[PDB]
């Protein structure tokens, strides 16, 4: 499934804005890390795929996401990067943890209103709905007691027919 770019930014930007609202916890995450300016060339050595809030914002605004799991993935990439580089004891690690707690409370309802099981990051074990092409966690939607001989169908598509 490809959503309209405007549909995704209306739905998802409130979750990004919740992170920007966190003062001071979000300040280290607003721009891409410049290792020259901060004096840490070893950033490049530890972090292979940099990400930050400004980049995520530009992507929503220019429509560079086709579906919301891509957005979730970028958010977690940013968190995992800061957790990887910074020591558990550092203020930035604790700040990152704070943003992830905030994101997890915001994201579930928002992803649900977009017709998804949840907003959590779990496996790469997904199932595509055979009607609308949304991807759900296998662990969220599949059950021993239910067989779909013609492929999985999410609850939204089931109510429609």
């Amino acid at each position: 499934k490809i959503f309209k770019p405007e549909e995704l930014r209306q739905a998802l930007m409130p979750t990004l804005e919740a992170l920007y609202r966190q003062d001071p916890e979000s300040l280290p995450f607003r721009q891409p890390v410049d290792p020259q300016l901060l004096g840490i060339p070893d950033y490049f050595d530890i972090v292979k795929s940099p990400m930050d809030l400004s980049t995520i914002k530009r992507k929503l605004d220019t429509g560079q996401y086709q579906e919301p799991w891509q957005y979730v993935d970028d958010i977690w990439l940013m968190f995992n990067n800061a957790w990887l580089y910074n020591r558990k004891t550092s203020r930035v690690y604790k700040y990152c943890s704070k943003l992830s707690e905030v994101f997890e409370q915001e994201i579930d309802p928002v992803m649900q209103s977009l017709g998804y099981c949840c907003g959590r990051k779990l496996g790469e074990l997904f199932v595509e709905c055979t009607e609308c092409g949304r991807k759900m966690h296998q662990i969220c939607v599949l059950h021993h007691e239910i067989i779909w001989p013609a492929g999985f169908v999410c609850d939204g598509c089931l109510k429609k027919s």
Binding site: P24, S26, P28, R30, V33, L38, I40, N86, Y95
Partner: peptide, 9 residues
């Protein structure tokens, strides 16, 4: 912020 050595808090 920018709370990563080089900078402060």
């Amino acid at each position: 912020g920018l709370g990563k050595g080089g900078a402060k808090a």
